């Protein structure tokens, strides 16, 4: 069986004083198509393959291509994936929950470098022999994630730096906890990064969370992000404040809202301020198909 799903989004993206002779406000848009082939067996083992075709405004050549494939095998809650895999530090819960606006962004997201599923081709040739192995396991609200990424599997392994990550999250109705650790993140020797997060559902309607990061070799240093969101009918309000250790950095903050227009259609906007005082704002719509 082959299925196709995806989403389109479009809207206004504003970057205060973007650059000499550049428009500060542009129309930023994305089309994402996922192609998923699955083979289900009577033994209870599923086999799957996936490809993505994603286009963003500004993409080179004004064209769209597929990325590199991802393969998986699932049995009894355990999934093993190979090729262009989802990594542990990118897949744990909570770590991206401060994101807001129609482009789902936040200065409160981790400021480190690490491997993650590659959405598109890479014209530099850097990903041509990149291959990962991932293993996930979900047991009674607890998820274990493990990933191993080799940037160039064809070359002798003592000559390449491979990335190893581990993560877990846990949740009941009110509290969630998550943690992740990745060594030699992004293929960079000694770039060991870590994440510890927690969130509290303080109402059926609202949540408050705190994420902490060790950003490894990044200049940001350790980081803390406090965020919250509250739902009023179809409207959700979101906010966050984030601080990094880099000397002289400002406190980053953001405020936004989402409006659930219909099933599959979400209108969102945000106003945010970064660590170097950048001022960014967005307003747009996402529709899932």
């Amino acid at each position: 069986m082959i299925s196709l799903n995806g989403y389109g989004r479009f809207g206004l993206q504003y970057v205060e004083d973007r650059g000499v002779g550049l428009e500060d406000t542009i129309i930023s848009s994305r089309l994402r198509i996922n192609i998923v082939g699955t083979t289900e067996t009577d033994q209870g083992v599923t086999f799957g393959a996936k490809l993505r075709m994603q286009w963003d405004d500004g993409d080179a050549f004004a064209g769209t291509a597929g990325n590199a494939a991802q393969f998986w095998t699932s049995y009894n809650g355990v999934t093993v994936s190979v090729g262009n895999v989802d990594t542990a530090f990118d897949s744990v819960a909570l770590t991206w929950d401060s994101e807001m606006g129609y482009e789902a962004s936040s200065f409160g997201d981790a400021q480190s470098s690490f491997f993650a599923y590659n959405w598109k081709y890479d014209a530099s040739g850097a990903l041509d022999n990149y291959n990962g192995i991932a293993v996930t396991y979900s047991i009674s609200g607890v998820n274990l994630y493990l990933s191993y990424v080799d940037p160039d599997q064809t070359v002798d392994s003592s000559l390449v730096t491979e990335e190893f990550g581990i993560a877990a999250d846990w949740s009941n109705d009110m509290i969630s906890l998550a943690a992740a650790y990745t060594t030699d993140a992004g293929g960079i020797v000694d770039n060991d990064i870590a994440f510890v997060g927690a969130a509290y559902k303080f109402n059926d309607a609202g949540t408050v969370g705190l994420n902490w990061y060790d950003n490894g070799l990044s200049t940001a240093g350790d980081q803390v992000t406090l965020y919250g969101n509250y739902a009023f009918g179809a409207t959700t309000v979101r906010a966050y404040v984030s601080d990094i250790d880099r000397a002289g950095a400002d406190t980053a903050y953001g405020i936004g809202a989402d409006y659930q227009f219909a099933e599959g259609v979400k209108v969102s906007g945000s106003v945010q301020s970064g660590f170097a005082n950048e001022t960014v704002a967005d307003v747009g719509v996402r529709f899932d198909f």
Copy 2:
């Protein structure tokens, strides 16, 4: 929801004396696949996204890729589109109705340069930041079309020439009228082009039309195309004669036929003569899937 539709065509394409050491007759063929994602809401607003994957014989690399995306929102007869849009001068009725043969061509089509939906990627980099906005509205047999195309939306707007177009068409059972006007067509300063057309259904079976064009900065000058078609059961006969103002140009003319083999399958051919005395002929088949 995601749907896929398209067409294939193949046949013989003849160009008298095409070039030194070149075959005059080649097998010309096209495969077009449209990928359309749509999100329908109970509020009566539809959201859609589309991508095209088109291959033509002779295409570089012997490969096929997707183009840049187009997004739209529709409500109550009004449609607003963004990104790789259909433009007013390209979408009005009547303007392409002299086309014939299996490749739908005619020297009687407008000889000007103007923006239009881009079917494929562009390796030059010219379309990387191209973005348009279009608005259509159909009211009781009358269609209004408006388009705005910015060739590079990232650069300050006083440094780029944007294209603005407007068009309308109107029809009852017997007569149709259409007009279009576009300023700075194709992003070229002062290339202001215009179109006025009319057609008369003089039988259930036949139609005769006249299209007039102001081709802006093109060397063709003003142009007039007289065309007609007549259906005899499953066979349609078509003809046209076109004249341009360019000094020394010949009168262009064409004669062709279509045969509706089955629903979705059309066999067509034509013999045509251009403004510089070029002699072209084609015979082939198109099938819709």
Copy 3:
């Protein structure tokens, strides 16, 4: 109508002493997606178009694109195809039946060069004007195949070498016979290649075959491949031995097995030795979707 089908495969590929500073064992994987548009008529004539999107580990840019299109028309057992066609020497029965392992390979396959369906784009530009015509006809267990491939249909034909192939196969329940001949194979003057094969079903369970080849201008010279396979429930065992005329060459051989895990899911492995003493081994899985 448009349909999508394909397969994914992944596994371990071992090449003894692959190269200085190279890993001998890598994870080799493939994703293949076929897009087929078909138009069926009440006259009994079917029209179809196909495109392929295939990704393999190691592919340049870590991206996937479509190949060049293939078109066909079918009526009463006869099929005529145009564009990126299947060729006679590649489509006859028996010629590939010694293949084994999850990558379906064998040193006992023909060692000649010849045109065949192109699975992907070609960045060299060599296939940009490549166009073939093929005609197949299946009559009571007998298949006739004819193919004509012009490497560059735009250039005068006396300047290009075109490939012409013919083939036939025939089978009853117990015996199969096949033969093929192709002149100027692969567009190389005087590279005339030929194949004669036969197979004997010596049980409901097992088959033994012999393929003979004239490899044209290849350095391999004439070649003979003896192969056999035997099925024990869901497990199939396969073997082959092949010899070429090239002076000094070793006898190539291979042993492997397939295990039919479920409908659409096959686990296969092999150990093989080539004409230059190369040692190769594989183990992996293929799943069809």
